[PDB]
């Protein structure tokens, strides 16, 4: 599923975009677009539109999970245990309208927003390495999800 070159390209793009923000300006610009393009997930996340600061709260807190998961892409025995739990958490949120169908799509559109921080440094290996790592990150959260 992943390779040493990709695992390295993943930890190399997370130390820059998530330097001190840990991915704060990554989900706020991604979730915001998802909420706008999708008016069915806004009430689910807890926002009224794309002009809501809450978006920067979820897209940010969520990015962190991807960070703790970036320190173990080849080791899917523990970093996947925490993500699997997040799914169980989404099984009873304040909206009870979560779905893994928005994950993939919201995951791909997320890599296009990461370039906003490392614009110019995000090469193909950066979006590809993360495009292969985010698959195991989110895919590992859909397990406990819909519980
Ligand atoms: C696109 C599908 C998703 C939906 C609809 C969704 C929805 C939500 C909602 C509604 C909350 C709580 C906000 C509130 O108070 O209402 C939340 C929290 C959170 N979500 Fe998601 N989420 C999705 C995908 C993800 C993914 C893929 C990750 C992981 C990368 C993730 C990680 C988190 C984290 C870490 C929190 C913080 C809450 C906690 O864990 O205690 N979410 N999500």
PDB file of C-alpha atoms and ligand atoms in Angstrom:
ATOM      1  CA  UNK A   1       0.000   0.000   0.000  1.00  0.00           C
ATOM      2  CA  UNK A   2       2.825   2.441   0.826  1.00  0.00           C
ATOM      3  CA  UNK A   3       6.587   2.564   0.139  1.00  0.00           C
ATOM      4  CA  UNK A   4       9.662   3.920   1.960  1.00  0.00           C
ATOM      5  CA  UNK A   5       9.964   6.753  -0.583  1.00  0.00           C
ATOM      6  CA  UNK A   6       6.293   7.680  -0.063  1.00  0.00           C
ATOM      7  CA  UNK A   7       6.454   7.281   3.732  1.00  0.00           C
ATOM      8  CA  UNK A   8       9.375   9.740   3.639  1.00  0.00           C
ATOM      9  CA  UNK A   9       7.564  12.150   1.291  1.00  0.00           C
ATOM     10  CA  UNK A  10       4.655  12.056   3.764  1.00  0.00           C
ATOM     11  CA  UNK A  11       6.752  13.010   6.811  1.00  0.00           C
ATOM     12  CA  UNK A  12       8.521  15.643   4.669  1.00  0.00           C
ATOM     13  CA  UNK A  13       5.269  17.416   3.713  1.00  0.00           C
ATOM     14  CA  UNK A  14       3.825  17.256   7.254  1.00  0.00           C
ATOM     15  CA  UNK A  15       6.783  18.944   8.994  1.00  0.00           C
ATOM     16  CA  UNK A  16       6.238  21.986   6.738  1.00  0.00           C
ATOM     17  CA  UNK A  17       2.443  22.333   6.419  1.00  0.00           C
ATOM     18  CA  UNK A  18       1.989  21.200  10.043  1.00  0.00           C
ATOM     19  CA  UNK A  19       5.102  22.982  11.366  1.00  0.00           C
ATOM     20  CA  UNK A  20       3.616  24.947  14.287  1.00  0.00           C
ATOM     21  CA  UNK A  21      -0.016  24.828  13.095  1.00  0.00           C
ATOM     22  CA  UNK A  22       0.000  21.002  12.956  1.00  0.00           C
ATOM     23  CA  UNK A  23      -2.235  21.385   9.877  1.00  0.00           C
ATOM     24  CA  UNK A  24      -4.388  24.311  11.065  1.00  0.00           C
ATOM     25  CA  UNK A  25      -4.425  26.059   7.663  1.00  0.00           C
ATOM     26  CA  UNK A  26      -5.084  22.727   5.913  1.00  0.00           C
ATOM     27  CA  UNK A  27      -8.524  21.600   7.097  1.00  0.00           C
ATOM     28  CA  UNK A  28      -9.877  25.139   7.574  1.00  0.00           C
ATOM     29  CA  UNK A  29      -9.339  25.755   3.841  1.00  0.00           C
ATOM     30  CA  UNK A  30     -10.442  22.207   2.940  1.00  0.00           C
ATOM     31  CA  UNK A  31     -13.497  21.651   5.171  1.00  0.00           C
ATOM     32  CA  UNK A  32     -14.702  25.173   4.299  1.00  0.00           C
ATOM     33  CA  UNK A  33     -14.796  24.222   0.599  1.00  0.00           C
ATOM     34  CA  UNK A  34     -16.404  20.855   1.424  1.00  0.00           C
ATOM     35  CA  UNK A  35     -19.101  22.612   3.486  1.00  0.00           C
ATOM     36  CA  UNK A  36     -19.800  25.045   0.620  1.00  0.00           C
ATOM     37  CA  UNK A  37     -19.707  22.568  -2.292  1.00  0.00           C
ATOM     38  CA  UNK A  38     -21.693  20.259   0.018  1.00  0.00           C
ATOM     39  CA  UNK A  39     -24.587  21.847   1.944  1.00  0.00           C
ATOM     40  CA  UNK A  40     -25.477  18.406   3.364  1.00  0.00           C
ATOM     41  CA  UNK A  41     -22.389  18.192   5.617  1.00  0.00           C
ATOM     42  CA  UNK A  42     -22.554  21.741   7.031  1.00  0.00           C
ATOM     43  CA  UNK A  43     -25.218  20.907   9.641  1.00  0.00           C
ATOM     44  CA  UNK A  44     -23.270  17.662  10.167  1.00  0.00           C
ATOM     45  CA  UNK A  45     -20.009  19.464  11.023  1.00  0.00           C
ATOM     46  CA  UNK A  46     -21.864  22.194  12.951  1.00  0.00           C
ATOM     47  CA  UNK A  47     -21.566  25.221  10.636  1.00  0.00           C
ATOM     48  CA  UNK A  48     -24.029  27.432   8.732  1.00  0.00           C
ATOM     49  CA  UNK A  49     -21.857  27.926   5.620  1.00  0.00           C
ATOM     50  CA  UNK A  50     -18.232  28.227   4.446  1.00  0.00           C
ATOM     51  CA  UNK A  51     -17.783  31.566   6.252  1.00  0.00           C
ATOM     52  CA  UNK A  52     -17.632  29.903   9.692  1.00  0.00           C
ATOM     53  CA  UNK A  53     -14.622  29.768  12.011  1.00  0.00           C
ATOM     54  CA  UNK A  54     -15.796  26.371  13.320  1.00  0.00           C
ATOM     55  CA  UNK A  55     -14.557  24.917  10.015  1.00  0.00           C
ATOM     56  CA  UNK A  56     -10.989  25.841  11.016  1.00  0.00           C
ATOM     57  CA  UNK A  57     -11.722  23.994  14.284  1.00  0.00           C
ATOM     58  CA  UNK A  58     -12.639  20.619  12.739  1.00  0.00           C
ATOM     59  CA  UNK A  59     -10.334  20.697   9.691  1.00  0.00           C
ATOM     60  CA  UNK A  60      -7.610  21.621  12.212  1.00  0.00           C
ATOM     61  CA  UNK A  61      -8.341  19.091  14.982  1.00  0.00           C
ATOM     62  CA  UNK A  62      -8.799  16.470  12.237  1.00  0.00           C
ATOM     63  CA  UNK A  63      -5.443  17.300  10.595  1.00  0.00           C
ATOM     64  CA  UNK A  64      -3.769  16.453  13.925  1.00  0.00           C
ATOM     65  CA  UNK A  65      -5.069  12.855  13.726  1.00  0.00           C
ATOM     66  CA  UNK A  66      -3.444  12.630  10.289  1.00  0.00           C
ATOM     67  CA  UNK A  67      -0.246  13.875  11.966  1.00  0.00           C
ATOM     68  CA  UNK A  68      -0.161  11.237  14.724  1.00  0.00           C
ATOM     69  CA  UNK A  69      -0.864   8.761  11.906  1.00  0.00           C
ATOM     70  CA  UNK A  70       2.017  10.128   9.785  1.00  0.00           C
ATOM     71  CA  UNK A  71       4.484   8.785  12.386  1.00  0.00           C
ATOM     72  CA  UNK A  72       3.427   5.188  11.606  1.00  0.00           C
ATOM     73  CA  UNK A  73       2.385   4.646   7.969  1.00  0.00           C
ATOM     74  CA  UNK A  74       4.075   1.235   7.681  1.00  0.00           C
ATOM     75  CA  UNK A  75       3.091   0.330  11.262  1.00  0.00           C
ATOM     76  CA  UNK A  76      -0.693  -0.141  10.992  1.00  0.00           C
ATOM     77  CA  UNK A  77      -0.914  -1.957  14.346  1.00  0.00           C
ATOM     78  CA  UNK A  78      -1.220   1.027  16.716  1.00  0.00           C
ATOM     79  CA  UNK A  79      -1.615   4.339  14.844  1.00  0.00           C
ATOM     80  CA  UNK A  80      -4.619   2.583  13.266  1.00  0.00           C
ATOM     81  CA  UNK A  81      -6.042   1.740  16.717  1.00  0.00           C
ATOM     82  CA  UNK A  82      -6.615   5.422  17.556  1.00  0.00           C
ATOM     83  CA  UNK A  83      -8.115   6.263  14.145  1.00  0.00           C
ATOM     84  CA  UNK A  84     -10.386   3.197  14.336  1.00  0.00           C
ATOM     85  CA  UNK A  85     -11.686   4.691  17.600  1.00  0.00           C
ATOM     86  CA  UNK A  86     -12.425   8.074  15.981  1.00  0.00           C
ATOM     87  CA  UNK A  87     -14.881   6.241  13.706  1.00  0.00           C
ATOM     88  CA  UNK A  88     -16.717   4.888  16.766  1.00  0.00           C
ATOM     89  CA  UNK A  89     -16.819   8.502  17.994  1.00  0.00           C
ATOM     90  CA  UNK A  90     -18.373   9.690  14.706  1.00  0.00           C
ATOM     91  CA  UNK A  91     -21.007   6.963  15.289  1.00  0.00           C
ATOM     92  CA  UNK A  92     -22.683   9.239  17.873  1.00  0.00           C
ATOM     93  CA  UNK A  93     -21.805  12.904  17.231  1.00  0.00           C
ATOM     94  CA  UNK A  94     -24.124  15.925  17.623  1.00  0.00           C
ATOM     95  CA  UNK A  95     -25.373  15.467  14.034  1.00  0.00           C
ATOM     96  CA  UNK A  96     -25.529  11.654  13.793  1.00  0.00           C
ATOM     97  CA  UNK A  97     -25.224  12.209  10.020  1.00  0.00           C
ATOM     98  CA  UNK A  98     -21.581  11.223   9.402  1.00  0.00           C
ATOM     99  CA  UNK A  99     -20.568   8.977   6.483  1.00  0.00           C
ATOM    100  CA  UNK A 100     -17.377   7.494   4.998  1.00  0.00           C
ATOM    101  CA  UNK A 101     -18.581   8.554   1.521  1.00  0.00           C
ATOM    102  CA  UNK A 102     -17.495  12.140   2.275  1.00  0.00           C
ATOM    103  CA  UNK A 103     -14.112  10.963   3.622  1.00  0.00           C
ATOM    104  CA  UNK A 104     -12.498   9.891   0.317  1.00  0.00           C
ATOM    105  CA  UNK A 105     -13.794  12.937  -1.551  1.00  0.00           C
ATOM    106  CA  UNK A 106     -12.997  15.273   1.363  1.00  0.00           C
ATOM    107  CA  UNK A 107      -9.614  13.498   1.556  1.00  0.00           C
ATOM    108  CA  UNK A 108      -8.627  14.082  -2.090  1.00  0.00           C
ATOM    109  CA  UNK A 109      -9.800  17.715  -2.020  1.00  0.00           C
ATOM    110  CA  UNK A 110      -7.698  18.034   1.161  1.00  0.00           C
ATOM    111  CA  UNK A 111      -4.387  17.312  -0.613  1.00  0.00           C
ATOM    112  CA  UNK A 112      -5.199  20.137  -3.059  1.00  0.00           C
ATOM    113  CA  UNK A 113      -5.508  22.541  -0.104  1.00  0.00           C
ATOM    114  CA  UNK A 114      -2.249  21.470   1.583  1.00  0.00           C
ATOM    115  CA  UNK A 115      -0.349  23.080  -1.317  1.00  0.00           C
ATOM    116  CA  UNK A 116      -1.705  26.391   0.041  1.00  0.00           C
ATOM    117  CA  UNK A 117       0.856  26.186   2.868  1.00  0.00           C
ATOM    118  CA  UNK A 118       3.818  24.605   1.041  1.00  0.00           C
ATOM    119  CA  UNK A 119       2.716  26.081  -2.306  1.00  0.00           C
ATOM    120  CA  UNK A 120       5.571  25.299  -4.719  1.00  0.00           C
ATOM    121  CA  UNK A 121       7.079  22.631  -2.440  1.00  0.00           C
ATOM    122  CA  UNK A 122       4.066  20.300  -2.753  1.00  0.00           C
ATOM    123  CA  UNK A 123       5.311  18.297  -5.762  1.00  0.00           C
ATOM    124  CA  UNK A 124       3.630  15.200  -7.244  1.00  0.00           C
ATOM    125  CA  UNK A 125       5.415  12.891  -4.775  1.00  0.00           C
ATOM    126  CA  UNK A 126       4.000  15.074  -1.976  1.00  0.00           C
ATOM    127  CA  UNK A 127       0.359  14.774  -3.105  1.00  0.00           C
ATOM    128  CA  UNK A 128       0.979  11.145  -4.132  1.00  0.00           C
ATOM    129  CA  UNK A 129       2.718  10.087  -0.905  1.00  0.00           C
ATOM    130  CA  UNK A 130      -0.097  11.687   1.122  1.00  0.00           C
ATOM    131  CA  UNK A 131      -2.698  10.405  -1.364  1.00  0.00           C
ATOM    132  CA  UNK A 132      -1.515   6.885  -0.466  1.00  0.00           C
ATOM    133  CA  UNK A 133      -1.098   7.579   3.267  1.00  0.00           C
ATOM    134  CA  UNK A 134      -4.429   9.385   3.776  1.00  0.00           C
ATOM    135  CA  UNK A 135      -6.065   6.232   2.370  1.00  0.00           C
ATOM    136  CA  UNK A 136      -4.838   4.137   5.322  1.00  0.00           C
ATOM    137  CA  UNK A 137      -5.477   7.037   7.726  1.00  0.00           C
ATOM    138  CA  UNK A 138      -9.149   7.630   6.860  1.00  0.00           C
ATOM    139  CA  UNK A 139      -9.802   4.011   5.810  1.00  0.00           C
ATOM    140  CA  UNK A 140      -8.654   3.099   9.342  1.00  0.00           C
ATOM    141  CA  UNK A 141     -11.226   5.502  10.836  1.00  0.00           C
ATOM    142  CA  UNK A 142     -14.169   4.065   8.861  1.00  0.00           C
ATOM    143  CA  UNK A 143     -13.739   0.818  10.833  1.00  0.00           C
ATOM    144  CA  UNK A 144     -15.072   2.077  14.183  1.00  0.00           C
ATOM    145  CA  UNK A 145     -17.153   4.537  12.122  1.00  0.00           C
ATOM    146  CA  UNK A 146     -20.859   3.716  11.479  1.00  0.00           C
ATOM    147  CA  UNK A 147     -20.766   1.484  14.585  1.00  0.00           C
TER     148      UNK A 147
HETATM  149  C1  LIG B   1     -16.294  13.832   5.718  1.00  0.00           C
HETATM  150  C2  LIG B   1     -16.783  13.071   6.762  1.00  0.00           C
HETATM  151  C3  LIG B   1     -16.741  13.540   8.059  1.00  0.00           C
HETATM  152  C4  LIG B   1     -17.743  14.138   8.731  1.00  0.00           C
HETATM  153  C5  LIG B   1     -19.129  14.369   8.243  1.00  0.00           C
HETATM  154  C6  LIG B   1     -17.214  14.493  10.025  1.00  0.00           C
HETATM  155  C7  LIG B   1     -17.930  15.153  10.992  1.00  0.00           C
HETATM  156  C8  LIG B   1     -17.441  15.528  12.217  1.00  0.00           C
HETATM  157  C9  LIG B   1     -18.208  16.237  13.212  1.00  0.00           C
HETATM  158  C10 LIG B   1     -19.631  16.667  13.102  1.00  0.00           C
HETATM  159  C11 LIG B   1     -17.387  16.435  14.260  1.00  0.00           C
HETATM  160  C12 LIG B   1     -17.721  17.127  15.537  1.00  0.00           C
HETATM  161  C13 LIG B   1     -18.106  18.592  15.320  1.00  0.00           C
HETATM  162  C14 LIG B   1     -19.381  18.890  16.060  1.00  0.00           C
HETATM  163  O1  LIG B   1     -19.294  19.275  17.256  1.00  0.00           O
HETATM  164  O2  LIG B   1     -20.471  18.740  15.445  1.00  0.00           O
HETATM  165  C15 LIG B   1     -16.119  15.842  13.905  1.00  0.00           C
HETATM  166  C16 LIG B   1     -15.021  15.825  14.727  1.00  0.00           C
HETATM  167  C17 LIG B   1     -13.811  15.255  14.418  1.00  0.00           C
HETATM  168  N1  LIG B   1     -13.532  14.621  13.230  1.00  0.00           N
HETATM  169 FE1  LIG B   1     -14.718  14.363  11.695  1.00  0.00          FE
HETATM  170  N2  LIG B   1     -15.899  14.113  10.154  1.00  0.00           N
HETATM  171  C18 LIG B   1     -15.605  13.523   8.947  1.00  0.00           C
HETATM  172  C19 LIG B   1     -14.387  12.978   8.627  1.00  0.00           C
HETATM  173  C20 LIG B   1     -13.296  12.941   9.456  1.00  0.00           C
HETATM  174  C21 LIG B   1     -12.026  12.358   9.096  1.00  0.00           C
HETATM  175  C22 LIG B   1     -11.672  11.730   7.793  1.00  0.00           C
HETATM  176  C23 LIG B   1     -11.219  12.508  10.163  1.00  0.00           C
HETATM  177  C24 LIG B   1      -9.908  12.088  10.274  1.00  0.00           C
HETATM  178  C25 LIG B   1      -8.957  12.469   9.349  1.00  0.00           C
HETATM  179  C26 LIG B   1     -11.996  13.188  11.172  1.00  0.00           C
HETATM  180  C27 LIG B   1     -11.511  13.546  12.405  1.00  0.00           C
HETATM  181  C28 LIG B   1     -12.223  14.216  13.370  1.00  0.00           C
HETATM  182  C29 LIG B   1     -11.686  14.596  14.654  1.00  0.00           C
HETATM  183  C30 LIG B   1     -10.312  14.326  15.162  1.00  0.00           C
HETATM  184  C31 LIG B   1     -12.672  15.243  15.305  1.00  0.00           C
HETATM  185  C32 LIG B   1     -12.603  15.829  16.674  1.00  0.00           C
HETATM  186  C33 LIG B   1     -13.684  15.271  17.601  1.00  0.00           C
HETATM  187  C34 LIG B   1     -13.092  14.200  18.475  1.00  0.00           C
HETATM  188  O3  LIG B   1     -12.413  13.293  17.921  1.00  0.00           O
HETATM  189  O4  LIG B   1     -13.305  14.262  19.715  1.00  0.00           O
HETATM  190  N3  LIG B   1     -13.274  13.452  10.734  1.00  0.00           N
HETATM  191  N4  LIG B   1     -16.156  15.286  12.648  1.00  0.00           N
END
